[PDB]
Structure formats: structure tokens, C-alpha cells
Design an enzyme around this catalytic site. Structure first.
Site, PDB file in Angstrom:
ATOM      1  N   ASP A  57       0.805  -1.251   0.000  1.00 36.83           N
ATOM      2  CA  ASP A  57       0.000   0.000   0.000  1.00 36.83           C
ATOM      3  C   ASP A  57       0.823   1.279   0.000  1.00 36.83           C
ATOM      4  OD1 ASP A  57      -1.502  -2.155   0.906  1.00 36.83           O
ATOM      5  OD2 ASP A  57      -2.380  -1.053   2.611  1.00 36.83           O
ATOM      6  N   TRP A  81       5.507 -10.321   1.239  1.00 34.40           N
ATOM      7  CA  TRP A  81       5.030  -9.557   2.397  1.00 34.40           C
ATOM      8  C   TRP A  81       5.690 -10.030   3.699  1.00 34.40           C
ATOM      9  CZ3 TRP A  81       1.485 -10.466   6.625  1.00 34.40           C
ATOM     10  CH2 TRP A  81       0.945  -9.301   7.198  1.00 34.40           C
ATOM     11  N   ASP A  88      -5.396   1.354   9.206  1.00 37.51           N
ATOM     12  CA  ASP A  88      -5.262   2.230   8.029  1.00 37.51           C
ATOM     13  C   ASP A  88      -5.787   3.652   8.250  1.00 37.51           C
ATOM     14  OD1 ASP A  88      -4.337  -0.215   6.950  1.00 37.51           O
ATOM     15  OD2 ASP A  88      -6.162  -0.520   5.761  1.00 37.51           O
ATOM     16  N   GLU A 132     -10.544  -1.741   3.729  1.00 42.79           N
ATOM     17  CA  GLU A 132      -9.202  -1.243   4.007  1.00 42.79           C
ATOM     18  C   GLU A 132      -8.964   0.131   3.393  1.00 42.79           C
ATOM     19  OE1 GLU A 132      -6.842  -4.824   2.615  1.00 42.79           O
ATOM     20  OE2 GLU A 132      -6.465  -4.981   4.773  1.00 42.79           O
TER      21      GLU A 132
END
Ligand SMILES: *[C@@H]1O[C@H](CO)[C@@H](O[C@H]2O[C@H](CO)[C@@H](O)[C@H](O)[C@H]2NC(C)=O)[C@H](O)[C@H]1NC(C)=O
Ligand SMILES: *[C@@H]1O[C@H](CO)[C@@H](O)[C@H](O)[C@H]1NC(C)=O
Ligand SMILES: *[C@@H]1O[C@H](CO)[C@@H](O)[C@H](O)[C@H]1NC(C)=O
Ligand SMILES: *[C@@H]1O[C@H](CO)[C@@H](O)[C@H](O)[C@H]1NC(C)=O
Length: 517
Positions: free
Chosen positions: A22, A46, A170, A222
Site C-alpha cells: 500500500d 510480504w 489504516d 481497508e
């Protein structure tokens, strides 16, 4: 660093090495666009999640910088990871973090705690807990100090959702001019609900409202955002929430994607417009109708007519397995954000926001017009890997589809089709035979987005191709479709295809784009 690798986008941001997800902390400050990002300093998938950092003056020529927030305990036992968030310029030093130099930049992010522990603030956190924390920078974002004395500043989801402590993330924070308050939007991800808080100092937060669920709910919510956008050419504005979900992305895709809501915001509550929410839980406003546009986040520090979002140009379904080396993932073309009334509806319109004149050849490598383009496929041209296509044509055409076949082998058994279905009034992108499609069974697909012709009956497409990507901007930008592709070295051919009949009033131009690296 030499960025000349197969699949390396030459006008899309990617880190020199390792995994990226992101976009984070998007802030324009003193002429500089900051791009932070979820980043693994120790691997190609990740993990070890940290905020990486790059800067540009023009959203085009990026310079990678040192890691901004390095996973705590990196190289040893990791005790805190820095999940997604945002950043602001606290120019009046409401936080008190300013000293006798520059006023502070403040980042607000989700702390993810892989292990139960007691923090320097004295707070105790559980394994896999997600909480909201802050850090500050006094050197224009180069280095950051975490607010250890009191982090996390929002430890828990709001009552009665305390059980959501593993999925609460977030934060998008911004200065709200009208109420003279800091506003943060967070996601209670599994409940498909956003929680909005306000603050006078970035440290002490008060819950003021919750938003949702509405529309698409087929995955965890998200990366929420909230921005004021201009509507049409007058003084009208509307507020827009952007939010991602994973999976449950746009129709025709499997995996992640980005939706939006148009409405109003009074400093505490976002009220959706009556025509932005739809009965049921599936129909949504899609920011992008393709598979590869996720975690779209907005820039702080920009004015009404200058707003920009950046999206992650990948999909959680297969993102871990795209055939890239030594990096993995790129950002999409930055998207200028505005609203236009189209078919009596306030509609998000995006423009491709890069310094095109600095990297585009002025003379097209291909430029043709056809009063009537015959049924069939035209002579082949060679485009290279990085280029823009402009197409316009009549919606009244008798063909079933009109398309450009691009990034194609010489015999077109490898190709990506980008075009328009006249009966369905849809853009389509067919990457079924686009190159390497071996790494996930859902990758070889055809994608679709709605695009009603303009008032003159003309359909317009602008198509940006980079080493491993295609982005389509339909009309004025009301419909975008973003899709990765992994074509072979020889896949640099193109031609036009008018299938099932002729296409009327065709105009086609192709311009080469130079590297930004
Ligand atoms: C998190 O980072 C660590 C490094 O700090 C990665 O650990 C390994 O990385 C290499 C494998 O590609 C090994 O060769 C190293 O010896 C090893 N390093 C250490 C210190 O453990 C780890 O893979 C990263 N995690 C993820 C999921 O990528
Ligand atoms: C800083 O102070 C001025 C004057 O009160 C005000 O206009 C502005 O909104 C404040 N905040 C920011 C973030 O600029
Ligand atoms: C196709 O283009 C090539 C290269 O310009 C040219 O040599 C050839 O004659 C063309 N073919 C036809 C049938 O137009
Ligand atoms: C198309 O060309 C490729 C080489 O670029 C070749 O491997 C393949 O066999 C060709 N396909 C057909 C059907 O001719």
C-alpha cells in the site's frame, strides 16, 4: 541504480529491491511529493513490514530514500510492524513535536504487534493487535521518531467492537479547514465499517461517527480516505470516501479492488448522497474496474483542483507470485481526482497525473484516421514496451468490438486486447494470452468497465502501456481499468482490430514514452 529489468515499469514507482504494498503517508510539502509505502526491507514477499520512502517534484521522477519506519527489531525478533497510514504537515505545531528548527511532519499509522508485550507507554498489547500510533519528523520526512511515551494513541476499536482488535487499521488523517480540527478515518475491517475521530493535537482522539457498511462488502474494508473534490466547472464540491476491499473487487475480477462514495462531510459525519448507495450489498461505485488497483490513498497538502490519489498496482489474489525480480509490485499512474456530472450523476473522473511532456515524444510513431475502418486487423506496427495510445471512434459502429491488440508477438498469438464492446457499451481488457499467465489461474481473464458514449456519440480511450502494465482511461476519465501483464521480449507489436463489422470515424495515435529512472 539500474532499473532496466524485464517487467520493470519505467514510469511507475517501484522500490529498487524487495516487496512493496500500500501507498502510505502521501504528502505534498514545500514542493516535494512524498511517497511512503508498505515495504519489506528483507524479502521479496510480504513481511518485516516497514514504511519505505521515495520523493519526487513532479509525481514522475522518483528518488528512493532511506526506510522511514523500520520494523522494530528488524534483523532480530520483530516486535512491531508499521502497517498503513498517512502523514500531515503540522505547520502550527499543534502536536508540540516541533523544536527550534522546522515544524513537524506527523505520520499516523497502524502498529501491528506480532507478540504480546508491554510498551514504553505502559500500555499492554495482545498478539496480533492492531492499534493507531504516531511518529514525527523534523527533517522534512527523511527520519522519523515514534511517539514511544504514549503510543498507541488509539489503542482499541470503539465500543461495542472491542473484539475487532486484530482488524482495526489504516488511519487517514487530515486537517479539516472548516472545523479547524484534525480528522482521522480508520477501518474496522471485518465489519465493513469506518470509524472517524477528531483531535486538536494529533495525540488525543475523540470518536465522532461511524460510516457503513454500504455497497460492496465481499471482503475486508481497508485504506479509507476522505477528500473534498470539485464538481464540474463551477464552485460546487462534494466529499468522497474511497475505500478498498479484499477480496470482493469489481465485477469480473477475483481479489482486491477500490470503491467510492459521494456525499457531504460536516467535520464529524459523512452523509452519503442518496444516489451513491444502492439497495443490497453488491452493487458499488468502482474507482477502477480492473484487477490491479488497490489500497488507493489520497495526498495531503494539495488544493481543491489539484487532488491526487495513488494506488497499488497489484492484487492480493496473485500479488505474491508475479514474476518480477529483484522487486515485487509497483504503484499505478498517479490519479488526478475530480467529479463530473455524467448521465445526471456526480461521477469520479480521473486523469493520468505525470509530467508527460518531460517523457513523451512529441511526434507519434503511429497516427491514422479512418472514415470507415474495414472489418479485420490492420498492418502491424512496432511500439516498444512503453507508450500511450489515443483512440476515438463512433459508438454507432456496426462492429461487435473495436480494439487495439498490443504488446503482441509478431503472429499475435500473444497479445493484450484493449477495446470497446458496442452493444454492451463497455471497455474491455483481455489479458488471457498476454504472456506469462502461469502463476495464478484467475490471471488469464477479460475485464470490463461501463462507458456510455459522449453527447456527440464519440467513444474515447487513452491507454498507457508500461513494461508490465496497461491502464485505460475511458471518456473524460469516468471509467478506468488497470491491469498488469507479463509479455515476452518480442511482444512489442500492435494493430487495430474491427471484429464483426466496420468501425466508423476512427482516430488512432501512439506516442513513445521514455524512462523516468
Ligand atoms: C524478514 O527479514 C529477514 C532479514 O532480517 C529475512 O530473513 C532471512 O532472509 C534471507 C532469505 O531470503 C536469508 O538468507 C537470511 O539469512 C535471513 N536473515 C535473517 C537475519 O533472518 C526474512 O525472510 C524476512 N521475512 C520475509 C517474510 O520476507
Ligand atoms: C494554522 O493556523 C492558521 C491560523 O490560525 C490557520 O489558518 C490554519 O488552518 C492552521 N492549520 C494548518 C494545518 O495550517
Ligand atoms: C505493412 O507494413 C509494412 C512495413 O511498413 C510494409 O512493408 C507492408 O507492405 C505492409 N503490408 C501491407 C499489405 O500493407
Ligand atoms: C508465433 O510466434 C512464436 C515466436 O514468436 C512461435 O513460438 C509460435 O509458434 C508462433 N505461433 C504460431 C501459431 O505460428
Amino acid at each position: 541504480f539500474n532499473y532496466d529489468q524485464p517487467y520493470r515499469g519505467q514510469y511507475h514507482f517501484s522500490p529498487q529491491k524487495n516487496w512493496m504494498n500500500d501507498p502510505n503517508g502521501l504528502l505534498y510539502h514545500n514542493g516535494t511529493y512524498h511517497l511512503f509505502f508498505q515495504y519489506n526491507p528483507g524479502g521479496i514477499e510480504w513481511g518485516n513490514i516497514s514504511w519505505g520512502h521515495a520523493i519526487s517534484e513532479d509525481l514522475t521522477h522518483w528518488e528512493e530514500k532511506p526506510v522511514a519506519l523500520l520494523a522494530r527489531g528488524f534483523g532480530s525478533d520483530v516486535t512491531e510492524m508499521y502497517f498503513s497510514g498517512s502523514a500531515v504537515a503540522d505547520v502550527n505545531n499543534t502536536s508540540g513535536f516541533g523544536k527550534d528548527g522546522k515544524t513537524p511532519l506527523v505520520a499516523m499509522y497502524t502498529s501491528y504487534y506480532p507478540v504480546a508485550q508491554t510498551l514504553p507507554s505502559g500500555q499492554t498489547v495482545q498478539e496480533d493487535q492492531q492499534s493507531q500510533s504516531i511518529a514525527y519528523s523534523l527533517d522534512d520526512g527523511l527520519t522519523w521518531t515514534t511517539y514511544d511515551a504514549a503510543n498507541p494513541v488509539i489503542p482499541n476499536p470503539p465500543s461495542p467492537y472491542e473484539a475487532e482488535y486484530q482488524n482495526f487499521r489504516d488511519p487517514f488523517v487530515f486537517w479539516h479547514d472548516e472545523s479547524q480540527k484534525w480528522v482521522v478515518v480508520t477501518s474496522i475491517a471485518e465489519l465493513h465499517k469506518l470509524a472517524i475521530y477528531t483531535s486538536d493535537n494529533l495525540k488525543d482522539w475523540k470518536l465522532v461517527s461511524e460510516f457503513g457498511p454500504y455497497n460492496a462488502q465481499g471482503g475486508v474494508w481497508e485504506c479509507p480516505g476522505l477528500v473534498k473534490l470539485p464538481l464540474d466547472s463551477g464552485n460546487s464540491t462534494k466529499w468522497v470516501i474511497t475505500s478498498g476491499l479484499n477480496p470482493g473487487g469489481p465485477p469480473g475480477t477475483v481479489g482486491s479492488g477500490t470503491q467510492y462514495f459521494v456525499g457531504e462531510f460536516d467535520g464529524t459525519t459523512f452523509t452519503p448522497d442518496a444516489d451513491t448507495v444502492y439497495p443490497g450489498n453488491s452493487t458499488a461505485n468502482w474507482m477502477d474496474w480492473g484487477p490491479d488497483f488497490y489500497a488507493a490513498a489520497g495526498y495531503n497538502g494539495l488544493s481543491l483542483n489539484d487532488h491526487v490519489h495513488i494506488g497499488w498496482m497489484n492484487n492480493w489474489q496473485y500479488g505474491a507470485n508475479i514474476p518480477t525480480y529483484p522487486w515485487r509490485s509497483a504503484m499505478a499512474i498517479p490519479r488526478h481526482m475530480a467529479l463530473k456530472t455524467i448521465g445526471s450523476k456526480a461521477t469520479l473522473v480521473q486523469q493520468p497525473q505525470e509530467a508527460w511532456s518531460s517523457i513523451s515524444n512529441k511526434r507519434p510513431i503511429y497516427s491514422r484516421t479512418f472514415k470507415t475502418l474495414s472489418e479485420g486487423s490492420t498492418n502491424t506496427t512496432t511500439t516498444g514496451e512503453t507508450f500511450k495510445v489515443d483512440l476515438s471512434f463512433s459508438a454507432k459502429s456496426k462492429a461487435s468490438t473495436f480494439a487495439i491488440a498490443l504488446r503482441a508477438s509478431a503472429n499475435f498469438t500473444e497479445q493484450t486486447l484493449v477495446g470497446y464492446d458496442f452493444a454492451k457499451q463497455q471497455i474491455f481488457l483481455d489479458r488471457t494470452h498476454s504472456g506469462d499467465v502461469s502463476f495464478d489461474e484467475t490471471f488469464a481473464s477479460v475485464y470490463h468497465g461501463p462507458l456510455t458514449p459522449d453527447s456527440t456519440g464519440v467513444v474515447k480511450l487513452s491507454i498507457f502501456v508500461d513494461r508490465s502494465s496497461v491502464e485505460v482511461f475511458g471518456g473524460q476519465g469516468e471509467t478506468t481499468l488497470t491491469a498488469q501483464i507479463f509479455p515476452s521480449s518480442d511482444a512489442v507489436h500492435a494493430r487495430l482490430a474491427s471484429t464483426g463489422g466496420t468501425t466508423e470515424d476512427v482516430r488512432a495515435d501512439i506516442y513513445k514514452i521514455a524512462s523516468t529512472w
